[PDB]
Amino acid sequence: DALSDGFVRLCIDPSLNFFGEGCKILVEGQMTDDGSATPDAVTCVTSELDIIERFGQGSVLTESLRKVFCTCKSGVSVYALPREDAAAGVKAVYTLTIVITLTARNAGTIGNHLSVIYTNLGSCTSVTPEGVTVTFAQTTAGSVNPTPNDYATVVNECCFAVYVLSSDDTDWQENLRDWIRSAWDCSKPQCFGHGYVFNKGTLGQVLADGDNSAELSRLALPTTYPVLPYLTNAAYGALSACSTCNNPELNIQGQTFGLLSCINMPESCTPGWTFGEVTQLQANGFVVSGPSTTSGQGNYTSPYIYNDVTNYLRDEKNRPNATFRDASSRRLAAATGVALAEFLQQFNGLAVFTKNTNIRTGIIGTNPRLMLGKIRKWAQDNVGTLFSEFDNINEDIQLLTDFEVQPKCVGQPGIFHLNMRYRPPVRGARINVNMAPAL
Amino acid sequence: DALSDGFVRLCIDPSLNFFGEGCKILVEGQMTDDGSATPDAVTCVTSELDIIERFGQGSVLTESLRKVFCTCKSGVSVYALPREDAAAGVKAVYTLTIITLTARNAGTIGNHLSAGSVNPTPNDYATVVNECCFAVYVLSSDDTDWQENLRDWIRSAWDCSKPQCFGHGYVFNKGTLGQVLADGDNSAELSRLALPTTYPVLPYLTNAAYGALSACSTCNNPELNIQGQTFGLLSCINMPESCTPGWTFGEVTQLQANGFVVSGPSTTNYTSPYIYNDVTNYLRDEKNRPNATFRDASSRRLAAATGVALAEFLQQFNGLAVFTKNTNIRTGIIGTNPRLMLGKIRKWAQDNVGTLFSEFDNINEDIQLLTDFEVQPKCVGQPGIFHLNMRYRPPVRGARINVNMAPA
Amino acid sequence: CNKQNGVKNILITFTDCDTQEVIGPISHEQPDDTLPTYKNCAWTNTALTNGYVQRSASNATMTLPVVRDLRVPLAFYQGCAQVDVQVEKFDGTVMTLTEGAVVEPEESDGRSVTMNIVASEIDELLPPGSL
Amino acid sequence: CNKQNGVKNILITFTDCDTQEVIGPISHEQPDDTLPTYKNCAWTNTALTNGYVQRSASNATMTLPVVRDLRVPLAFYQGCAQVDVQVEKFDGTVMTLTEGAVVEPEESDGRSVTMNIVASEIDELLPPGSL
Amino acid sequence: CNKQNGVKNILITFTDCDTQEVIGPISHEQPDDTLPTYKNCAWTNTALTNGYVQRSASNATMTLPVVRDLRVPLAFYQGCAQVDVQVEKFDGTVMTLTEGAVVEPEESDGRSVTMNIVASEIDELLPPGSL
Amino acid sequence: CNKQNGVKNILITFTDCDTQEVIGPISHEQPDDTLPTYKNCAWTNTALTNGYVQRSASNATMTLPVVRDLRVPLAFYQGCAQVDVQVEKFDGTVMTLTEGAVVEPEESDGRSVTMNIVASEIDELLPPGSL
Amino acid sequence: CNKQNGVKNILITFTDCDTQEVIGPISHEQPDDTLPTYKNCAWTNTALTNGYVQRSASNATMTLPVVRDLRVPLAFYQGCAQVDVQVEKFDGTVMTLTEGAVVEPEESDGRSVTMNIVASEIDELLPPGSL
């Protein structure tokens, strides 16, 4: 043919997948019956075309996956956990009186959040013809949501960095929280993770939905929120995952790092949350989001998030436990733990001398003091990427064999004990400028 | 026909807007029942053709907006706040002997043509205009209650608690010397345009023209002073020439003293009045009787522009990094310590001289950045937060000449 | 010890003029013991006869030898980008330069580069105690 | 180590401008400790009064000292043939130059030659992790 | 950077006067550092005695050194065809000329041609913010 | 200052002769170190035989190289509008020219313009201490 | 290369106007780096007022520096004989000229001669890809 006989093999197609996975994310939500995805089974998605084939069209899960793909062009692998609609199919029903009756495609309270707006008034180009009185007042609200609670079986030993939930069911949220908390069990090898969920409603009730969950990022959404909440939740989770990935230190804040570009919301003059209770939400560990440009009427504006923190406000007993306030500290702790676990793997199977610390020439081994020196060197090499400068290296790193940490005849050869007290990096938060137009 | 087939679409509409532009201006005035605009609702107005139907024919707001478009060919995007007439609104009654004339809107706004009473007191700025930020606010009546409410809301807009939303307002006060002085308020959020008792032109028209001229002049140049026959000439307003001045020279001097904008004729056929001074009403500080920090209208605009620009410039430090105290920055890390931040702030302030400030006196003293964990007393400081101070100085402009001729 | 001559921090910010994308401010490391060299006064004088001096407008220049960052293209160091360079010395003095341009880029080997940065003015910080 | 300065591979492809015969690519070796030296920015800048800069078109040049191959005529190394030179450093950087020309030949002793290659543009591979 | 002096785009359209065939607009490249020069005022003021001048009709001229395109005959660059030149500078200025004629052809070597274009008027763009 | 030679402030006022808009006085900047060059005496003397000279009416002429202002059309600098020029030197003297005219414009690149200004008289400040 | 400027082949055929003896074509040589220049357009333009151009007839001139061939008398190169020259540039362009006559010969040192060839028209090859 056209000199394509052998060596070269062209596969022209406008749908390909490039990246080599890394920094996995899991999305779990309801699915329409049209899709062919196996219910209650984690699956890996590769592109955007297959999303409609697997999980149907119009479902919450496919829209969340589309937003995740839009926000994350490359750098992560997306995993999905399809879920079937609950047995009680109470599908939410709207009404577009002009009269058009609108029905949600998935039953439950998930279909009870939808706002339709009309770009009336002047708007230059949006001059409406005389008449056309659009009305939107709903007819009935859905209910009954699935409560799978089958994490221990579907996902047994697959560690996921980010968990995305596309529902406001408090029981579902607390089940996911309990599973992720159980992932940090000292009796088993851990799967460090973090889940993002949303809590839409008035200020009075949203505070009730929150608790001391250090492993959830509650996203406060007002009653008059136009965008579908799960789209914003998925965009926030994907933005966090791709922004951090291999750089688990960046805080998702500002018009440079905390911009949900894919999401677009109509301009408004009432700024959703009001400043005093914006501060109230800031105080009690809630992720507050706002408009990029408030100003006045015009075109759409992308949303804008604040305070990339977790819903952790209390210690085991005391109030001020800031060790897990920021979401960046969580990823920093997970990365430090994993990296340290990898680093110490070199000592597996190595010979250790404790009584006579004179290694014979040619012997491949070491003694506890040399291990302590190597560990201190490794800790010093990670300053600026995982830790602060440091407090005082003599006392905050300790290597002890079990013989001298346990009483008479309680120890056992080959067991050590390492204690480390690191401090995360520091970042700026406020300015408080004070001007004075003196003459 | 011609080239017009598919690609390229033609339109010969003789009433067309151009672009969205900027420098939004809000005008508030009563509307007649014939209009279709929703009362207590702020909307954008694009052209002068559709005003007559949206705000009625002969209404005060319609005339004010028409004069605003006359004064400003481009550079602003006007916003209108129609107000329905009072329920208990007495109509203005005129009688001409040679024709019985009546105003088209009930209230006292019809008594200034050369009688009605009770004007609607809505006091609803907090909800109708919640977070919209308007550079210029225009009020189209002499009711002191509206002026007080608008001044109070504008003062609340600059309050330090919530994020600031700067703005300025223009109001008029027509009457005798005793009446106009009593209306004066120490607040610099309003510019009282004083008018004589025998003023021929309707007052709201002149006030709207002045506000539009101020907004369109400043816009992106918040330093020009509306003053003189070149910068403060109202070319739209025409009034018949007269030999009797509305105000005596001493009267003008007293009005100038007490923070009142005074207009004057251009020839002393129809003549276009021009503004003498662009001074606001900032007679006294909270207890300091003399204070020139806010006398001129340019001071408020300069302060707002400097604040907004400085806030925008500081946004780069949003979660970048801060290696305060600690040590020096490592290699490859993206961050900065307070010393470098102070240096960059000083550089920004120095580069901004000539358009927002004037030289400075000692930039090492006027500019002062301080970390918060040391500005407050012992154990009061809190980490991850800064402080900043800035004693900038506004530019200077020309004044009287005091010429003295003598032959020989 | 206060009596120390050297450079403590070097921060460079790149702003591509074609796409208006800002990179930095990244920290940089010296390749050798040659310190950055400055010229603050924006006017250049010329000698005339018998004490007179002809004063004319000129630039504020700066010579900056540093080590390139492996995450930044080399072309950004040779005049295809606008630099925002800020250097802190051991004695507390801070040199701030904004909206700079590289004038005469010499060829580099891919590790160490020397910039001839030009700007309208350079800001001096003068650690506390002045005049 | 990841901390090393030096070259790893240097390939040069020669194309005859008369008979259109292509030779290479052939690996080459350094004659001394001097590394190939690059200038990537295709525009040159000229200092003007008070911070202004005059942008004019220029070339992406390279200085390349190599030991000539005994299977290739010396004239091919002195501007009588096209060169498609490509150099990879130890840290992962790869600079690619195609359709280059040797501008100013110099008297070589018959073993080591120093090329001054001028081309429209030079591509950088910029090892993983960018901007 | 906006502190830059130089051209960015040059477009020439040739209209042959015999067959009325239109070629262009085609982008062009500068041969050297020289920038095109302009003369917009259509009048000339011959100086007279005691402050008076004599206004007279003249032409809006232009000098344009460009590298010719290999797809266009050289005769088109030396007065046998019309020119429609449009020059855009780095600061946003756009100079538009139409119905121009090359007034004084000069010996060209076949690569770089310098035009002396004479036209009735030239239009400036004056990037936003004028008078 | 003490004995410096140079210019500090340059003010030009443009007055259109066909529409009578007045723009200025606008500050300007020198492109290089070539100072403005002046001729005040409005008479030129022609040498004749045996110490005799001839007096004929002449023009007070001013030469001014300045950088074009991006907000002002270039045609204003080339004789399409009256010029009112006022410049201050470092020594303190001020030269005032009113109702000028550009006589012999030459093609400029759009950034640097040299003005050949004619007038009927030119005023001098002569800093304190005269005759 | 396809990116090279220069001349490749020069062919001159001499035909004396007295004996009609035809010698050539002979490959000639360039004395220095100066390339031949051209003016292919056969009509000359002159400046008039308000964009007008007075068209007048002219010639397609040619300047040609060559090295004298010792087998050919020098007087042939200086106007006692017709020349039919054809020189091809490196980019493929061919300038074919027939029945040319040198107009203004000047002193030559015996090796290098600078032609001033005049003709009614000059041909152009325009390597493939035209208009």
Side-chain angles (χ1 to χ4, degrees), chain G residues 1-16:
Chain G
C1 183
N2 65 7
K3 284 162 91 43
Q4 281 179 354
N5 178 24
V7 292
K8 220 174 83 162
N9 294 320
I10 310 175
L11 294 174
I12 303 169
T13 301
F14 303 100
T15 300
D16 167 2

Side-chain angles (χ1 to χ4, degrees), chain A residues 254-321:
Chain A
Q255 311 103 320
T256 61
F257 316 108
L259 196 68
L260 314 166
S261 63
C262 299
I263 308 303
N264 287 43
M265 61 195 258
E267 71 274 8
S268 77
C269 300
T270 296
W273 305 112
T274 61
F275 185 44
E277 57 95 15
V278 187
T279 305
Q280 285 259 322
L281 276 173
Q282 297 256 27
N284 48 21
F286 272 110
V287 184
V288 181
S289 311
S292 199
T293 61
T294 312
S295 291
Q297 273 63 39
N299 282 322
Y300 313 98
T301 185
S302 178
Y304 182 76
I305 73 153
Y306 293 165
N307 57 27
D308 179 23
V309 298
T310 56
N311 200 3
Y312 185 70
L313 291 166
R314 288 88 74 200
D315 197 75
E316 188 67 29
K317 304 92 181 193
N318 206 356
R319 298 293 296 164
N321 196 348

Side-chain angles (χ1 to χ4, degrees), chain A residues 125-136:
Chain A
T125 64
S126 184
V127 298
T128 181
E130 277 78 7
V132 176
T133 311
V134 175
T135 307
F136 194 111

Side-chain angles (χ1 to χ4, degrees), chain B residues 175-178 180-181 246-257 262:
Chain B
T176 186
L177 173 53
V180 63
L181 292 176
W247 270 337
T248 77
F249 192 70
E251 175 80 18
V252 193
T253 59
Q254 284 105 28
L255 285 170
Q256 296 277 324
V262 174

Side-chain angles (χ1 to χ4, degrees), chain A residues 121-124 250-251 253-257 269-271 275 294-297 304 380-381 383-385 389 426-439, chain B residues 17 24 43-44 79 130-133 161-163 293-294 306-307 310 314-315 318-323 326-327 330 333 384-394:
Chain A
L121 296 174
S123 181
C124 171
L250 191 43
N251 289 114
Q253 290 171 356
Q255 311 103 320
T256 61
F257 316 108
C269 300
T270 296
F275 185 44
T294 312
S295 291
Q297 273 63 39
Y304 182 76
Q380 265 294 348
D381 291 331
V383 168
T385 184
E389 300 71 49
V426 57
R427 186 160 279 102
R430 323 189 88 268
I431 290 300
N432 296 335
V433 58
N434 302 332
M435 291 195 38
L439 73 165
Chain B
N17 56 3
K24 39 175 63 191
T43 50
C44 58
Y79 275 94
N130 198 25
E131 297 319 307
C132 299
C133 280
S161 161
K162 68 158 68 159
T293 64
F294 285 129
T306 49
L310 183 63
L314 294 174
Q315 273 290 340
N318 200 304
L320 183 63
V322 171
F323 287 77
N326 294 315
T327 181
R330 315 266 302 176
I333 316 294
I385 190 167
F386 280 93
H387 271 82
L388 195 153
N389 300 99
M390 183 177 177
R391 201 165 59 66
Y392 83 90
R393 188 177 222 287

Side-chain angles (χ1 to χ4, degrees), chain E residues 75-88:
Chain E
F76 281 179
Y77 289 77
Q78 290 159 355
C80 294
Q82 275 178 29
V83 298
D84 273 28
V85 60
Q86 213 164 0
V87 177
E88 193 206 333

Side-chain angles (χ1 to χ4, degrees), chain A residues 412-425:
Chain A
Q412 192 79 256
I415 297 89
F416 292 84
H417 272 79
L418 157 65
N419 301 118
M420 191 185 278
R421 192 188 307 139
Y422 70 97
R423 314 271 91 191

